[PDB]
């Protein structure tokens, strides 16, 4: 493992220092359907004309990125995404830009969002939730070893592949940082107290977020919720967590250690690092190497009724992709 990560870091650093750029163009893709939207863009299912492969194409409007002050985050996203490689990270296949937009063309994950499956089914069983959580634990072990903080874990950003394994997407808040950082970003339900309190923070925020995710998966609702974000923040800072009566004692113990306001005590962040999590009793039945190797039988296999099928995704209003005849924000996105 120490050996594996060392080699992983070597690979990452070469790509980090010499990013891939301009590796395709828009007309090589046929636009099929909108798979999702966000504040400054959308993700579309596309077909690559020369191979017939399907991809998910994230299209970000440069002007909207600038208005929302997300230029540096967007540059982070692409630079980091093109440099990483892990079984549970969605792969970036191509990227390019035109007068209007930035494009990131990623592997297509046909099983849909965990969010969709979780809301419909209500909640996952503990073994089911454990299976997904293990994969997140390994992914965060990988990312953090590269000095990356992920900062946007939630079921909306986790996709389920044809084999029932998870694929993490959305590196919009990912950041390579050795010290501590201060940006107030993420999703309200998932924010660690130190982010809310403007303390400056580190990778431990990802481990808190993992606690929120596990809780949400197993309960069917997050540990801290309300109608308005301000009310959510108040609950988080109080930190009083209540668990459903059906949560096992082991699960509760793990969650009390992840949803731990005290940074000297939060799991993931101590002397033993990720091992405090990997060796916790709730994970006793988990074969970490088999998980990594994808040799474990998934608890749930998405229904796939053909290639390019999209029945696992919600329908979104389809809008025209317009490319201005003038270059927008060229200087801001020069490195993209």
């Amino acid at each position: 493992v120490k050996e594996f990560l060392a080699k992983a870091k070597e690979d990452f650093l070469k790509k980090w220092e010499s990013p891939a750029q301009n590796t395709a163009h828009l007309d090589q893709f046929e636009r099929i359907k909108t798979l999702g939207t966000g504040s400054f863009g959308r993700v579309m299912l596309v077909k690559h004309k020369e191979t017939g492969n399907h991809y998910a194409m994230k299209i970000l409007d440069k002007q909207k990125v600038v208005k929302l002050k997300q230029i540096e985050h967007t540059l982070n996203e692409k630079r980091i995404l093109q440099a990483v490689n892990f079984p549970f990270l969605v792969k970036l296949e191509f990227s390019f830009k035109d007068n209007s937009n930035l494009y990131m063309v990623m592997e297509y994950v046909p099983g849909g969002e965990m969010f969709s499956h979780l809301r419909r089914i209500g909640r996952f069983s503990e073994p089911h939730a454990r299976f997904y959580a293990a994969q997140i634990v390994l992914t965060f072990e990988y990312l953090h070893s590269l000095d990356l903080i992920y900062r946007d874990l939630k079921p909306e950003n986790l996709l389920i592949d044809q084999q029932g394994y998870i694929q993490v997407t959305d590196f919009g808040f990912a950041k390579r940082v050795k010290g501590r950082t201060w940006t107030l970003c993420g999703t309200p339900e998932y924010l660690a107290p130190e982010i809310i309190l403007s303390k400056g923070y580190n990778k431990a925020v990802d481990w808190w977020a993992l606690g929120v995710l596990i809780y949400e998966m197993a309960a069917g609702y997050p540990p801290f919720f309300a109608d308005q974000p301000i009310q959510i923040y108040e609950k988080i800072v109080s930190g009083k967590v209540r668990f459903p009566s059906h949560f096992s004692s082991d699960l509760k113990d793990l969650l009390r250690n992840l949803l731990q306001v005290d940074l000297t005590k939060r799991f993931g962040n101590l002397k033993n690092g990720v091992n405090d999590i990997k060796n916790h009793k709730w994970f006793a039945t988990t074969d970490w190497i088999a998980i990594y190797q994808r040799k474990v039988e998934a608890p749930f296999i998405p229904k796939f009724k053909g290639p390019g099928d999209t029945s696992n995704f919600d329908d979104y209003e389809e809008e025209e992709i317009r490319v201005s005849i003038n270059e927008k924000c060229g200087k801001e996105f020069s490195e993209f």
């Binding site: 808040f173 107030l184 970003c185 309200p188 339900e189 069917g220 609702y221 919720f225 309300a226």
Partner: peptide, 19 residues
């Protein structure tokens, strides 16, 4: 129940990031 409270809340749909 907490579940009923969640389901009746305004945050059971996809949640936006704060920027």
């Amino acid at each position: 129940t907490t579940y009923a409270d969640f389901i009746a809340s305004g945050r059971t749909g996809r949640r936006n990031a704060i920027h």
